[PDB]
Amino acid sequence: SSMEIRVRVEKDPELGFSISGGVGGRGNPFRPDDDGIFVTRVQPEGPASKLLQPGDKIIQANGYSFINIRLEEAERLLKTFQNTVELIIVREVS
């Protein structure tokens, strides 16, 4: 059971969260057999606080699909975007 969430994070100066995972990558601490990109830590007083949560799977960012993406490409895109970034994430619920 899960929900899909569309959120806008205003870089100031970064998005304020970390990512793990990726195709051909080293995995993630949330869904071991999923090669997706996962929000891993969120900076507590940063632009993503109260918007994203650890474990959120990023499936789209500024219109780029993050399904089947390499970690390095996800990171470099997210760092290259300017100002407000629109994310679509998937959040699991117990």
């Binding site: 998005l15 969260f17 970390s18 793990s20 995972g21 080293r26 601490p29 891993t40 990171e75 997210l78």
Partner: peptide, 7 residues
């Protein structure tokens, strides 16, 4: 192990 990258 998995690793993380800040953005």
């Amino acid at each position: 192990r998995w690793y993380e990258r800040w953005v």
